[PDB]
Amino acid sequence: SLFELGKMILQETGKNPAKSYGVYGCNCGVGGRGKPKDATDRCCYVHKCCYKKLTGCDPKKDRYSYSWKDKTIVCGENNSCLKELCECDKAVAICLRENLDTYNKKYRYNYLKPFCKKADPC
Amino acid sequence: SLFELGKMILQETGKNPAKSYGVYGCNCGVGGRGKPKDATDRCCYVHKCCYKKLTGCDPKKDRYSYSWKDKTIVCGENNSCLKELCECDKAVAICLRENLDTYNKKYRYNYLKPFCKKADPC
Ligand SMILES: O=C(/C=C/c1ccc(O)c(O)c1)O[C@H](Cc1ccc(O)c(O)c1)C(=O)O
Question: What InterPro entries does the record tag this protein with (chains A, B)?
Fold first, then answer.
């Protein structure tokens, strides 16, 4: 669910996840996908495509548990949606961390998301 | 389309429409609906429910014709759906104008949109 996703992003990036990514670029947070502005945005693009692969899951509401082993996220749920959502969320939190150095606050509150150029199909 | 809506909002409110309303509250701009935060937001809630009622046209994409003369909006009726779409947009622009007095900049970039409480079904 959103709560787990936010926590993973917070735990991997150290940033306030909704504030920093909730409206970032053409793909992060609210709304859909669009041409990525940068690497951080591409992380979010990939994340939304990851969600789209799933059938019958609710990425916003479906709560799952995850744990830490050796400072790495462990997705141990047996429920297929919960496992897959967890893996999508883990991947985007890692990707956002990996690309932290090019985070650009200019993109943080993108009130022009609806005018983003159309994303390529997932 | 978003172009006519933005034009009406700028005509009626004098505000940069995407900057002022593109991420405002739980209902304005990008994203879906949610419990309205204030009167401006409630304008946006009603607007998105208006869009949901339409049949036969696409509120994001489809252009339509209206006139702005003597600071009054008149919607064209060459197409019945575009007429209704135009009326949705006209109503939100007026509603936003009339609630500018309680516009709250703290709600302008609502990066917590996905955590809005469930909106009233339309
Ligand atoms: O706790 C909530 C929301 C709870 C909630 C309430 C209704 C919903 O429909 C829903 O999906 C969630 O709001 C925020 C939570 C929050 C999450 C991630 C952040 O990065 C943050 O700054 C705040 C707050 O503390 O003000």
Answer: PLipase_A2, PLipase_A2_Asp_AS, PLipase_A2_dom, PLipase_A2_dom_sf, PLipase_A2_His_AS
Burial (CB < 10 A; 0-12, 13-18, 19+), residue A43, is buried
CA–CA distance, B21 with A88 (Å, rounded to integer): 31
Rounded-to-integer distance, Cα A83 and Cα B13, Å = 47
Instruction: Name the residue range of residue B85's domain.
Output: 1-122
Residue nearest to atom 2 of ligand 1 (CA): B115
Other residues' Cβ atoms within 10 Å of the Cβ of residue A64: 18
Which residue, B23, B44, B18, is CA-closest to B33? B44
Q: How was this structure determined?
A: X-ray
Greatest extent of chain A over all pairs of C-alpha atoms, in Å: 42
Active site annotation includes A41: no
Helix (H) or strand (E) holding A67: strand A67-69
Distance CA B40, CA B37 (A): 8
- Cα B80 to ligand 1 centre (Å): 40
Contact status, residue A91 vs residue A84, Cβ threshold 8 Å: no
| Count of domains observed in chain B | 1
Q: Resolution (in Å) of the shown entry?
A: 1.6
